[PDB]
Amino acid sequence: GGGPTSSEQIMKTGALLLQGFIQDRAGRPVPQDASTKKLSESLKRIGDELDSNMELQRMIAAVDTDSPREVFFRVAADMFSDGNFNWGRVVALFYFASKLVLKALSTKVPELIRTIMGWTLDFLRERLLGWIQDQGGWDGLLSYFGT
Amino acid sequence: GGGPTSSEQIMKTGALLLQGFIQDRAGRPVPQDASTKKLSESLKRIGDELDSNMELQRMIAAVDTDSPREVFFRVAADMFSDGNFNWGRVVALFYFASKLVLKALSTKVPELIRTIMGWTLDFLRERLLGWIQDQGGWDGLLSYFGT
């Protein structure tokens, strides 16, 4: 039963805060206690402020994220390379983690659309093509819609 | 150089229509010609109508999609098992494909949040934990925010 200074409480509360923070921005709910809720509120509004920092957004938009773990560790090391610490940097790091999540999804989306189109077009070719040809192709669907 | 009835035009136009349709719903732009644009418009509004069919939404929400390819082929076979064809079924199949895309992303999101939290908390533990302890843990961040 350690207090706030214990590493166990630090890792526990850290996970909670981070998850709440990331999930919040990804929704665009994680059960937490009152003081943790107060911190989550401050975090949320700072993330909002950073979302409006337009130079930062363009920078993050441009970094290529096919090896996102390399990117995360390189940015994290660089942010703290001068041997200084403050809470603003920790907040900033959390913000960066949430941006990586969103960046990662965005690279998944086209591949997912491609894979599923693959299934659908394969089914269409082997099972529907004959009937579609009898309609005179997709122009038959124009007729159907009354165009 | 085949017309609308050729299988080549059918597969080409089919991919275009499907991609436009899925991307449209995923955004929530794919270059196409005028008649293909007319079809895309009708498709879009039907998808809208199906999005409001609430029983269908609950049904699709409930199907488990960890093996989404099995699901797609089983639904597709079942939809056409009676040996009948019409354009409404083809539209409906396209709609289902777009719902699979969205369903697939939704199962990716938590795993992605987990992996990235993993990196961040690992970095925090090895590099920031000592300094955070000197602040008296996360309560130090409450102080920082002026709470």
């Binding site: 130079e55 290529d64 660089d78 001068d82 940097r89 960066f96 | 920082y144």
Partner: peptide, 30 residues
């Protein structure tokens, strides 16, 4: 590439700077 390494370094520097200047407000922020 070396052009990506510049962007990454840029991101890190901007984030460190953002963090360092959050001190200058009550409540902290931009």
């Amino acid at each position: 590439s070396e052009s990506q390494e510049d962007i990454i370094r840029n991101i890190a520097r901007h984030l460190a700077q953002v963090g360092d200047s959050m001190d200058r407000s009550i409540p902290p922020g931009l």
